[PDB]
Design a protein around this ligand. Structure first.
Ligand SMILES: [Ca+2]
Ligand SMILES: [Ca+2]
Ligand SMILES: [Ca+2]
Ligand SMILES: [Ca+2]
Ligand SMILES: [Ca+2]
Lengths: 416, 5
């Protein structure tokens, strides 16, 4: 929501300025907004010709007279009792979402209390209307979802999530609840879910901990502390072992070098030499020196390191991992290198794996659709279609059914 | 609600 004010000089068109206005104290467009907003700009009218004005601006002044807290009619009158030469102060109100490459965008005509009310309708309905719940939650941003929950708490004294927990079930429930959770909560939850088995969901732990950034991980680490009264680092230690533990615990610190300004070419060469020397060039492997280079260095640096590695090593980094280590450690390294090299491709391959064969690994599918829909889902779809020849939408369509399917399809954003 | 201007 970036706000910039501006003046615009219009010469009245044939029959008027060429736009429609809405709002007023007695006609609030969104709750608690008496502002006067342009709704339509006429097709081939004077307003379109000057351009500047945009379907959505807030009118604050007409010929110097302010539009704050007016009834609809008084604002209309100011326009109709004006000259043919009209100058107005507008506030352009562009809003930008976190990533440009997420699929779920913040809804432009957002009203927290209104949304909350229709959801209550869909809950307070015989059979419950699972469709309208999906239609608003998957089209609202995560932060918009927060505000929905807050207004829901207010209107019911019950919170949004535990009303959907009673009114939803199956795979559909998982998705909706996951979207209700902030990115830190959801990740913290999937993480607590991973370790609460003693045998532990290594593949999921590897997925989150290899793919989250410093910013995300530090947020997880704090919220993890708040939800389960343990340090996440402590749980990792208690449910892993060997160099896998060292690799995981080092990543989960979220203390990787942030992308500096200058490119350290000397260090790129040194790191490449050391990865070669520590591994394929030597009998056995120096795992700790792998762990240090791959956890400590920034992502752009490591991408470049992996290319320089090919200058020295007859195999590339992934191929070198497969021939030096096995088990969870091999797994963690292959996943970490994929995330460093192409994270959207990483996720597109995990999604394909979760659907390619019999049944569906629903936990991996849901998790990715929820946690990447506002990050890089569009890059994920582009890599998916390029590699697999059919869209992500299509695979979701072939593997999932019902309202659950339509929910995943919305988080996908569309076909390709 | 909407008003041409
Ligand atoms: Ca039903
Ligand atoms: Ca050497
Ligand atoms: Ca070796
Ligand atoms: Ca660096
Ligand atoms: Ca399948």
């Amino acid at each position: 929501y970036l706000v910039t004010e501006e003046e615009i000089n219009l010469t009245r068109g044939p029959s008027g300025l060429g736009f429609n206005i809405v709002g007023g104290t007695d006609q609030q467009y969104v709750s608690n907004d008496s502002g006067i907003y342009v709704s339509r700009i006429k097709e081939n009218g004077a307003a379109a010709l000057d351009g500047r004005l945009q379907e959505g601006d807030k009118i604050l002044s007409v010929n110097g007279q302010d539009l704050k807290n007016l009834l609809h009619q008084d604002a209309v009158d100011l326009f109709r009792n004006a000259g043919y030469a009209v100058s107005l102060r507008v506030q352009h109100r562009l809003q930008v979402q976190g990533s440009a490459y997420g699929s779920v965008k913040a809804y432009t005509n957002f009203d927290a209390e209104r949304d909350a009310l229709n959801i209550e309708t869909a809950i307070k309905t015989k059979g419950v209307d699972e469709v309208t719940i999906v239609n608003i939650l998957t089209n609202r941003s995560n932060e918009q979802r927060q505000d929905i929950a807050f207004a829901y708490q207010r209107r019911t004294k019950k919170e949004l999530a535990s009303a959907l927990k009673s009114a939803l079930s199956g795979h559909l429930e998982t998705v909706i609840l996951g979207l209700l959770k902030t990115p830190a909560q959801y990740d913290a939850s999937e993480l607590k879910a991973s370790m609460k088995g003693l045998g532990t969901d290594e593949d999921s732990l590897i997925e989150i901990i290899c793919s989250r950034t410093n910013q995300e991980l530090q947020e997880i680490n704090r919220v993890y502390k708040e939800m389960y009264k343990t340090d996440l680092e402590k749980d990792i230690i208690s449910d892993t072992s060997g160099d896998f533990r060292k690799l995981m615990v080092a990543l989960a610190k979220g203390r990787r070098a942030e992308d500096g300004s200058v490119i350290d070419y000397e260090l790129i060469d040194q790191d490449a030499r050391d990865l070669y020397d520590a591994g394929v060039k030597r009998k056995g492997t120096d795992v700790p020196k792998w762990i240090s280079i791959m956890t400590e260095r920034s992502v752009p640096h490591l991408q470049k390191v992996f290319d320089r590695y090919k200058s020295y090593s007859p195999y590339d980094m992934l191929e070198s991992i497969r021939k030096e280590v096995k088990g969870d450690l091999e797994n963690a390294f292959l996943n970490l290198v994929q995330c460093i090299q192409n994270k959207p491709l990483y996720f597109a391959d995990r999604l394909y794996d979760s659907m390619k064969g019999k049944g569906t690994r629903d936990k991996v599918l849901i998790r990715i659709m929820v946690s990447r829909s506002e990050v890089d889902m569009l890059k994920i779809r582009s890599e998916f279609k390029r590699k697999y020849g059919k869209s992500l939408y299509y695979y979701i369509q072939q593997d999932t059914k019902g309202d659950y399917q339509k929910a995943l399809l919305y988080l996908c954003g569309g076909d390709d | 609600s909407e008003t041409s201007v």
